Design a protein around this ligand. Structure first.
Ligand code: SF4
Lengths: 273, 270
């Protein structure tokens, strides 16, 4: 009823919080919208960072249409510039309970008027806690055939033990979630004083991890502090609350944008078989 | 146990893993060594980065003395250089359990380490404040003489918005009666190889004011230097366009840890 015209649903996964998985979701969304797709982002990771905060709409009023909730507009579609619309909904609008809280969460998600949508990215909570696993089942239960394109697993090179990406991958295999690929966030550094991107500790090992699972490796994302500034203050990056509709335009000046453009283009060829 | 001649025991604490705690412990050890103190390091943090691997003694064969394990010598004292001996002992020396049994073995392992004469014993604890880890802290409190346990150093990250992490450590230190030597805000900024320019975009004093609001010492701010990692990994001296303790003198982090160490020493002996 709510997702009946959403073409592709992608879950953004993590075995542990603190990997910047909500940053990854934000930039996947912006990049897909820069490629001309209509993008939705559903945030059900109430522990992790606020996705509406990153889109500078954390103070927006969720409008109510006849029979549902209208997602918050980050920016409208723009044919002349070839960018698609971008809309967001947060579980924090609905919100200390047990199974009844799962039932309310499921009703709420089924109440969002997503309308036509090329891609709906889901910011899922980290880890496979019994509370989270049932929510993951809920999505699968309400998903329709062919719709769930699969999952994107976000990790870091820094993790000595990959038991959480091993865990999230194993859960995906166990439940049939297709793994579209793994993203290695915070692998290297881009900085303002000069554009040189460096990771002298190159072997983050996340790629061999992707080999061990015969699973796709979408690429490495460096830290760019000008991205965090852009999200926080709205300042456009330069290389030697903010207005939300300007974000996608300022993002193509961020050094991370060409990286996510390539990650996006490969995610799209994977989902479209 | 066998703390019979350990003058000062410092706990390095953390609300959660991945904050660079084991590396902070590593550099406190090197700095205390460069200041002429004999130093031991007890790694009881299995989930974190292997501290033996940091000191480049991960392939050592630990020996058995008089009813217990003998610590591995990273380097011995050198009065000429003014550096002191540096020993490490970790579980990763002896493993190629979960639940209460895991912590039982870890408590028994701690009991079985023969430390002998020592100015400072640094203890790399597992993060968090679970009841298991509390039991580890309680054991140390019992085997420690009234002046022996100097206090706890709490490592935190400015990027993390979970300040309460800090709080549950200093609440727990005050609940167990463990002095708080200070807070170290790690991963605060980033030094770069292409030029020694440190970049930091967080509050630039947010950890300072938060430690003031808690009435706890603020020991200082430590940025990320990837050349420290390549030195730990390949022995390459950090350049900024023999022994680890001496090569580390060329790492930008070393003057930072000289000042932090010095403040800790003043706090300890008063
Ligand atoms: S400008 Fe270049 S050399 Fe300076 S910190 Fe940034 S990356 Fe490093």
């Amino acid at each position: 009823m709510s997702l009946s015209q959403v073409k592709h649903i992608i879950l953004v996964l993590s075995g542990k919080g603190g990997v910047g998985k909500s940053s990854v979701t934000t930039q996947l969304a912006l990049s897909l919208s820069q490629a001309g797709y209509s993008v939705g982002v559903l945030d059900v990771d109430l522990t992790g960072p606020s996705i509406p905060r990153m889109f500078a709409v954390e103070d927006a009023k969720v409008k109510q249409g006849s029979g549902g909730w209208l997602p918050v507009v980050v920016h409208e579609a723009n044919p002349s510039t070839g960018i698609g619309s971008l809309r967001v909904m947060s579980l924090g609008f609905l919100l200390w309970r047990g199974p009844k809280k799962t039932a309310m969460v499921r009703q709420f998600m089924s109440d969002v008027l997503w309308d036509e949508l090329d891609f709906l990215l889901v910011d899922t909570p980290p880890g496979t806690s019994d509370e989270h696993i049932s929510l993951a089942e809920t999505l699968l239960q309400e998903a329709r055939p062919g719709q769930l394109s699969g999952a994107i697993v976000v990790t870091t090179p820094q993790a000595v033990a990959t038991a959480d990406v091993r865990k999230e991958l194993n859960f995906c295999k166990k439940t049939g979630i297709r793994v579209l690929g793994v993203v290695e966030n915070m692998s290297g550094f881009v900085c303002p004083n000069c554009s040189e991107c460096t990771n002298i500790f190159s072997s983050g090992g996340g790629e061999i991890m992707a080999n061990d699972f015969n699973v796709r490796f979408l690429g490495r994302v460096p830290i760019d502090p000008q991205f965090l500034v852009l999200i926080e203050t709205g300042k456009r990056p330069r290389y030697p609350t903010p207005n939300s509709s300007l974000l996608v335009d300022k993002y193509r000046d961020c050094s991370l944008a060409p990286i996510f453009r390539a990650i996006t283009a490969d995610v799209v060829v994977a989902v479209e078989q």
